[PDB]
Design a protein around this ligand. Structure first.
Ligand SMILES: [Co+2]
Ligand SMILES: [Co+2]
Ligand SMILES: [Fe+2]
Ligand SMILES: [Fe+2]
Lengths: 302, 300
């Protein structure tokens, strides 16, 4: 209909349901695995992904959006292999995940050839299959907006324009790279409301998060559990403030989980065991959290 | 007995034969190929690799060292798939090809763990097979010696210590990164005569090339055909001068070919360099030094 699924017929924007917007089934470095298969376990990765997903479906999750692309080891075979075993709505995307420079393949070649790769996934299929991409993923971090990074950003804009699919981003919360990605995408003609700026839940500075939201774009409070970036209690503190400041129309929650001495209670359900119960406790009607997990993904893919 | 082959029983370090020390049957970037198979052809890629190798065998090539590692899309299944169609002595290796940073899988990692990856390919096997690595490959370029690049270099040393296999490198000729590779490896107890500093045939400055040869390291005149870095006539001009200055014992020639620069093929050396090289006062013994005896003592 509007949103393509992995191993399922496409569905309408409005049937997305309760949705975890940023979760990784598995995530590796293509080169490292292609060259040393002995370091991995196809069966253990598969199980860890199965019982984590179906646990999320028990809690009420209907749709998981997986932003695993090039540089994070996308594999629609493994994705459809785990959808068949769970029945989950898996939205796969396309894009490129880099911090500094991009592969030598792309050395000195056209920013429109990059976007053609995304377009290929969106319209034609992914990795030789009919599974199509529902979004495009881009990244930046400590380096931030390096010449090569910028090309990817800009290539996403093109793909958005040509296919209307939304854009999930990876950013660093402490170095303005999130705002920069928004600027460059808005400047290039991208509906601010089609942009999810991610990982900005790793900071206290609420003013920075608001400026991004005030400018039309979804804010990603999407790393619940990863206490090295921000403790759960401190993330919960913020999210509540942003709700009580009337920003629920642009808040998106997720875990950024990848199926320990400091990865404590990190999992694809930490939100239900702590986060949601904490909100309600501080008076936040099921309307204020259906917005976040149902209506915000609704208008994002609409 | 000494040097492990792809699809063949290990051979003795004295039986290398005529060898091309730096040739790539195929290279790509796993990230792009894993994500977009539609962009490649595992069949045309095979044919190009077949007829190019046997043409080198028809010029008298007995061994081909292939320094395709992580980042360049090493694939022993494709390598052994082309050895059964040619019968060529293919020496595969292990190591990491990067300029700045290495995969996110290598964050707060112990540079020994990096070494252990090489040692695994050397002693155990490559990509779940019994084909073993005969050398370790490292790189550096315009960015130079980054912190992460330096980790790879030092990890190759640890693999050298433990397995005694040689080290082939990729360097930029115009930024002292080759000398730095030798500087670090020697300072980490690496036998200077087990190191091949490559791509230094891309420059005129013979003084730079000598200082690397004078410290015990083989000099890689290994990109014949790639006129974009140096024209063939200017490489030949530069090789000859080094021979007649008594540096034949430390010279290794190759193409760095990947199955402007139009004459670039894996046999360009026989069609131009060799003929030229010996019409200008270069005996057959000294060319055997470069293509047989220098790979000999490199893998010895
Ligand atoms: Co991220
Ligand atoms: Co090279
Ligand atoms: Fe993520
Ligand atoms: Fe090479």
């Amino acid at each position: 209909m509007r949103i393509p699924l992995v191993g399922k017929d496409s569905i309408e924007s409005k049937d997305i349901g309760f949705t975890l917007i940023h979760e990784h089934l598995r995530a590796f470095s293509e080169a490292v695995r292609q060259q040393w298969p002995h370091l991995y376990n196809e069966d253990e990765e598969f199980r860890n992904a199965v019982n984590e997903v179906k646990r999320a479906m028990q809690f009420g999750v209907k749709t998981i959006v997986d932003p695993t692309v090039m540089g994070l080891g996308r594999d629609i075979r493994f994705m459809e292999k785990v959808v068949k075993a769970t029945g989950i709505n898996l939205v796969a995307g396309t894009g490129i995940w880099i911090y500094i420079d991009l592969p030598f393949y792309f050395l000195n070649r056209s920013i429109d050839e990059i976007a053609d790769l995304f377009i290929h996934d969106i319209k034609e299929g992914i990795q030789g299959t009919l599974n199509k991409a529902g979004f495009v993923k881009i990244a930046a971090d400590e380096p931030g907006i390096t010449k090569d990074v910028e090309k990817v950003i800009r290539a996403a804009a093109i793909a958005n324009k040509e296919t209307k699919v939304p854009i999930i981003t990876h950013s660093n919360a402490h170095n303005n790279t999130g705002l920069e990605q928004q600027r460059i995408l808005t400047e290039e003609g991208v509906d601010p409301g089609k942009i999810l700026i991610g990982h900005l839940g790793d900071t206290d500075n609420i003013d920075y998060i608001k400026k991004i939201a005030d400018k039309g774009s979804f804010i990603g409070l999407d790393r619940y559990g990863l206490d090295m970036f921000l403790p759960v209690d401190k993330r919960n503190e913020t999210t509540l403030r942003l709700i009580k400041d009337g920003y629920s129309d642009k808040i998106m929650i997720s875990h950024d989980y990848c199926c320990p001495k400091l990865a404590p209670r990190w999992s694809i359900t930490l939100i239900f065991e702590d986060t949601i119960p904490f909100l309600k406790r501080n008076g936040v009607n099921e309307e204020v959290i259906a917005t976040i997990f149902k209506e915000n993904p609704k208008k994002f893919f609409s």
